[PDB]
Structure 1
């Protein structure tokens, strides 16, 4: 039918195939997208381990940045919701900021508490890669790195899917200190 990926809680992720792990990113990372031919890219932005925005790129000609606190910017220019352009629809559906891409075959959402969500159509079965993992029911193989190799460490996988820019170059993220 359709897959679901979620980035929820403080530092947690849930893949399309059900693999679930923690990652406290410090840069922007590829959540999902066309994995050989990347017609679109869904990019999750982090800051100090916390999530700050859910960006989408349609192949370098259009980019949109849906922040947790309701702000939307197309490029660096701020825009107001609802917004519709080039097949992308930003709407406050059910009180949660939606970003629909029906033509591209995906639906994204940010809830009121900052939890991201991505629903990806069946056409991307076994053809996507990113922090949401691939999309094939086998969950053990979701940690494929961008180099094309599996890894048992969630952080190796996640850092493999980092994306830098001209004003933010990604540092190697590592697990934080904790008490338990």
Structure 2
């Protein structure tokens, strides 16, 4: 809840600005986030979590149809209740 300044680098999380756009790197933990001026979240993530990370950006598999596996684990046809 304490507002900090920027940039910021604690706990292996460099919180930087690149190309006038804000960045959050976690290369130890294998991810790089960022935002643009308008607001467009982006998440770069390694190959280490292939068929692991299940969430709102779906699994990191090859397929694209089966990447709605709910918090229970259920292939759903709706992109909404998921």
The alignment's TM-score, normalised by the length of structure 1, stands at: 0.45
Higher relative contact order (CA 8 A, sep 6+): 1
C-alpha deviation, 1:155, in angstroms: 1.2
Kindly report which structure 2 residues correspond to 1:106-145, keeping only aligned pairs within 5 A, or say none: 106-145=31-70
Which string of whole-angstrom CA distances, capped at 9 and with x for unpartnered residues, describes residues 102-125 of structure 1? 000000000111000000101011
Equivalent residues, number:
82
**Residues 145 and 156, structure 1, Cα contact 8 Å, conserved in 2:** no
Q: Which residue number in structure 2 is paired with residue 96 of structure 1?
A: 21
Question: 1:154, CA displacement in angstroms?
Answer: 1.0
For the aligned residue pairs, the C-alpha RMSD in angstroms reads: 0.6
Runs of 4+ aligned structure 1 residues displaced above 6 Å come to: none
Gap regions ≥5 residues in structure 1:
1-75, 158-180
Instruction: State the secondary structure of the residue aligned to 2:48.
Output: helix
1:150 Cα shift?
1.1
Q: CA offset at residue 148 of structure 1?
A: 0.5
TM-score, structure 2 length as denominator?
0.96
